[PDB]
Design a protein around this ligand. Structure first.
Ligand SMILES: [Mg+2]
Ligand SMILES: [Mg+2]
Ligand SMILES: [Mg+2]
Ligand SMILES: [Mg+2]
Ligand SMILES: [Mg+2]
Ligand SMILES: [Mg+2]
Ligand SMILES: [Mg+2]
Ligand SMILES: [Mg+2]
Ligand SMILES: [Mg+2]
Ligand SMILES: [Mg+2]
Ligand SMILES: [Mg+2]
Ligand SMILES: [Mg+2]
Ligand SMILES: [Mg+2]
Ligand SMILES: [Mg+2]
Ligand SMILES: [Mg+2]
Ligand SMILES: [Mg+2]
Ligand SMILES: [Mg+2]
Ligand SMILES: [Mg+2]
Ligand SMILES: [Mg+2]
Ligand SMILES: [Mg+2]
Ligand SMILES: [Mg+2]
Ligand SMILES: [Mg+2]
Ligand SMILES: [Mg+2]
Ligand SMILES: [Mg+2]
Ligand SMILES: [Mg+2]
Ligand SMILES: [Mg+2]
Ligand SMILES: [Mg+2]
Ligand SMILES: [Mg+2]
Ligand SMILES: [Mg+2]
Ligand SMILES: [Mg+2]
Ligand SMILES: [Mg+2]
Ligand SMILES: [Mg+2]
Ligand SMILES: [Mg+2]
Ligand SMILES: [Mg+2]
Ligand SMILES: [Mg+2]
Ligand SMILES: [Mg+2]
Ligand SMILES: [Mg+2]
Ligand SMILES: [Mg+2]
Ligand SMILES: [Mg+2]
Ligand SMILES: [Mg+2]
Ligand SMILES: [Mg+2]
Ligand SMILES: [Mg+2]
Ligand SMILES: [Mg+2]
Ligand SMILES: [Mg+2]
Ligand SMILES: [Mg+2]
Ligand SMILES: [Mg+2]
Ligand SMILES: [Mg+2]
Ligand SMILES: [Mg+2]
Ligand SMILES: [Mg+2]
Ligand SMILES: [Mg+2]
Ligand SMILES: [Mg+2]
Ligand SMILES: [Mg+2]
Ligand SMILES: [Mg+2]
Ligand SMILES: [Mg+2]
Ligand SMILES: [Mg+2]
Ligand SMILES: [Mg+2]
Ligand SMILES: [Mg+2]
Ligand SMILES: [Mg+2]
Ligand SMILES: [Mg+2]
Ligand SMILES: [Mg+2]
Ligand SMILES: [Mg+2]
Ligand SMILES: [Mg+2]
Ligand SMILES: [Mg+2]
Ligand SMILES: [Mg+2]
Ligand SMILES: [Mg+2]
Ligand SMILES: [Mg+2]
Ligand SMILES: [Mg+2]
Ligand SMILES: [Mg+2]
Ligand SMILES: [Mg+2]
Ligand SMILES: [Mg+2]
Ligand SMILES: [Mg+2]
Ligand SMILES: [Mg+2]
Ligand SMILES: [Mg+2]
Ligand SMILES: [Mg+2]
Ligand SMILES: [Mg+2]
Ligand SMILES: [Mg+2]
Ligand SMILES: [Mg+2]
Length: 56
RNA sequence: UUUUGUAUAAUGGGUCAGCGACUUAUAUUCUGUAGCAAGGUUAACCGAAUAGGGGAGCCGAAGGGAAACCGAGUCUUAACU
RNA sequence: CCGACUUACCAACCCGAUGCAAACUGCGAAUACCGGAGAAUGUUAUCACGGGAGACACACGGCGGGUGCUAACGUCCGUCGUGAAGAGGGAAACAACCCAGACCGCCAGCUAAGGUCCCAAAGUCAUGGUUAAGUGGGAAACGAUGUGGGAAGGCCCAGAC
RNA sequence: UGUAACGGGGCUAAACCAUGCACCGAAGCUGCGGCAGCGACGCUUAUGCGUUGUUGGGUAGGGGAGCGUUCUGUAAGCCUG
RNA sequence: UCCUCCUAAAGAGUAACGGAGGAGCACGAAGGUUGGCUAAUCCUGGUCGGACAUCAGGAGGUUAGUGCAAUGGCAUAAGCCAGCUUGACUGCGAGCGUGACGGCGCGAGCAGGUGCGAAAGCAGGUCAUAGUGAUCCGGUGGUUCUGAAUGGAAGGGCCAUCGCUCAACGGAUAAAAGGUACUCCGGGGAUAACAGGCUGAUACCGCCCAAGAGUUCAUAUCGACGGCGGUGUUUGGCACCUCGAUGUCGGCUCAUCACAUCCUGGGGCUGAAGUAGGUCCCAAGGGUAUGGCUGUUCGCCAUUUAAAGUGGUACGCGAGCUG
RNA sequence: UGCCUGGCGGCCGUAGCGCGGUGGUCCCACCUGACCCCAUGCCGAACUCAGAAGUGAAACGCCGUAGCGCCGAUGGUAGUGUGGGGUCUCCCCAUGCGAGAGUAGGGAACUGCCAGGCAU
């Protein structure tokens, strides 16, 4: 279980960068989401690391 | 208004008041609603007459094949699992 | 005839070394594309049918290219973003650049881009060096004892310069 | 055409390359109140009585719900010197 | 109109008046099967015989060949020869690929009847990708499907098939050229010329090395073979503003700004003895001609001037004039 | 159980070339002859038949040799997906992927089944 938050917009981003946020459940700026720790979530975090921040 | 793009030095209007631009008939398809239901429904017309009669007639319940023709099967081909 | 020779010259095949090619690959990625399984999330976001449209004049920016002068806010193709159809802050002004997607109201607070001397809201903030040209605040080949450094080298107290 | 290649004043830093701590800075995010749609759930529906999550920029265009005027029936009713 | 490669950004596809080439056929064998075989080139030797015909070996290993243009493939050969034959058959077709669609292509396998091979097996056209044209209309053959009172038939219908460089090749008609400055309408700055805008291939100007010319000596003064920049001044590229009008070349009057200055002013070098000169730097305060020719700016000539500038202002200025 | 040989395979160069030796009990190859089965665009050269006198010369199988071919590291370089930048017809930073060429080096194949001859 890890905590993720979004800190940047998804306006000029790629479709694969917005679908990643859709999969992570992020809705807007500063949306705190709890997600299970798994290689899939880690890969998503690596993919959108420039706009997300983890609390661990 | 037209444009990728108008404060544009692209067009329109001096202002006010009145008038002014997806309507009508018939025919077909679709949606909702209402009656009836494997049936539904009349037109012309008669009728003192929005009643009633008139089911002539139209759609659908059975389709296949060009057509004869056959039939919940048919055509295709001498014959097709 | 046959030829004996060298000779201000050029040069085939092969060998050794150095390169080039969108229409050359004995080599060969990253990305992208097809399919399967799996956890999580997304208002089925997917497909099929039926009713109704609108549109087929796009532009700019990034990356990958052709034609141009490796010129054009030039033109032609692929991908993404924006405008078109998107308000707001910033770049002094600015359709396409950056941040960021306006349900409404509040004389509440927190931030991103971008800034904190005044216009104009915020540090005349602290330590550390550079610049003396208003460089900052438009530009090249090239030239110069301009300085701020780093690493070496020659000559040199029998005397260098 | 008139400074006119920092926006201007002005700056020997208020310029640049390096470190850090603060602040300003948007319709971005958080706080309060209010409206509407979709979907889950028990409302045994009153089709709404609480929840909860989410969404609500918008041209052409599509869908849905509505306001206003004339006349007609309700209406020999009602208001009105 | 159709075929091959690249551009085409390693799935497919993907444009330009982009770069390179082809097709509008041919074959009863150049098809199928069975059986067998492997060259291009070079070297050596040998009669006519030569660099190269034919014959022997050796090296080489597809560097040849594909009926054709290119690409992808071909040794089990798809290449090269011989024999036998017509599967260059009929009716079907699981399941796919590609297209907006019409449509096109690959196809295991089924029923009948064949060819080759002893047989297993192969053959529903050529190694593959171009060799092509919707519909209507009309013709031919066959067809027991129809046959307008009945029996026939004409005609029509199903199958095979024929006729179109419809080449503008998804084809508007069975058949079709030009002028308008006598002109006209709806429209476009979606699209033309002057002008304005972006860039600067061209134009002008500036700068760098120095081979040299310069009686010796590169740089008093010029400057090759080459290179780097500036103005947006010419001829030009794009077509972003304007076609429900921004009036255009030249001339007259009227000027203004700039300096890469024609004179005046000051200076450096000089292959500057002096006058008179050449080159370069600063400097825009002022001035900067009259006539013949031509509509002309430009330009030629005559004669002056201390000098008779370069360019911008919508190639300045027509709600100032001229035509 | 070993050695050698033949056939059918697996993989397709660390598997292939070249140099030097070895092998004939058996197998294999070379080899003898041909009216016949059969054939040569002529020819027992090839195919095929009847045989084993002779030979391991050639081919073939085996052995060792690095004159070639071949494989091939680690590290580094180019390139590149995503996000930021600069002096932007070209590069840099952060995080992942990571070549090719070349060097050191490896390397004279391995193996399955069915058969034949000699030892056991
Ligand atoms: Mg956990
Ligand atoms: Mg326009
Ligand atoms: Mg504006
Ligand atoms: Mg317009
Ligand atoms: Mg206007
Ligand atoms: Mg107009
Ligand atoms: Mg007007
Ligand atoms: Mg109805
Ligand atoms: Mg019927
Ligand atoms: Mg059936
Ligand atoms: Mg290439
Ligand atoms: Mg997938
Ligand atoms: Mg069109
Ligand atoms: Mg178009
Ligand atoms: Mg376009
Ligand atoms: Mg454009
Ligand atoms: Mg580009
Ligand atoms: Mg351009
Ligand atoms: Mg602009
Ligand atoms: Mg254009
Ligand atoms: Mg539009
Ligand atoms: Mg905006
Ligand atoms: Mg948007
Ligand atoms: Mg703004
Ligand atoms: Mg600006
Ligand atoms: Mg502003
Ligand atoms: Mg704050
Ligand atoms: Mg900040
Ligand atoms: Mg202040
Ligand atoms: Mg201070
Ligand atoms: Mg001035
Ligand atoms: Mg605010
Ligand atoms: Mg908000
Ligand atoms: Mg609230
Ligand atoms: Mg809305
Ligand atoms: Mg919103
Ligand atoms: Mg009434
Ligand atoms: Mg491709
Ligand atoms: Mg691709
Ligand atoms: Mg053939
Ligand atoms: Mg054969
Ligand atoms: Mg000869
Ligand atoms: Mg060829
Ligand atoms: Mg053949
Ligand atoms: Mg059969
Ligand atoms: Mg037979
Ligand atoms: Mg062919
Ligand atoms: Mg016709
Ligand atoms: Mg008759
Ligand atoms: Mg009959
Ligand atoms: Mg015809
Ligand atoms: Mg066509
Ligand atoms: Mg007109
Ligand atoms: Mg235009
Ligand atoms: Mg023009
Ligand atoms: Mg204009
Ligand atoms: Mg000389
Ligand atoms: Mg021009
Ligand atoms: Mg005009
Ligand atoms: Mg006008
Ligand atoms: Mg005019
Ligand atoms: Mg001067
Ligand atoms: Mg002055
Ligand atoms: Mg004075
Ligand atoms: Mg005279
Ligand atoms: Mg003029
Ligand atoms: Mg004039
Ligand atoms: Mg005027
Ligand atoms: Mg005249
Ligand atoms: Mg023997
Ligand atoms: Mg023999
Ligand atoms: Mg031997
Ligand atoms: Mg490596
Ligand atoms: Mg990048
Ligand atoms: Mg390597
Ligand atoms: Mg290597
Ligand atoms: Mg060997």
């Amino acid at each position: 279980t890890i905590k993720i938050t979004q800190t940047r917009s998804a306006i000029g981003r790629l479709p694969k960068h917005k679908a990643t946020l859709l999969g992570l459940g992020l809705r807007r700026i500063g949306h705190t989401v709890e997600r299970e720790d798994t290689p899939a979530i880690r890969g998503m975090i690596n993919a959108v690391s420039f706009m997300v921040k983890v609390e661990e």
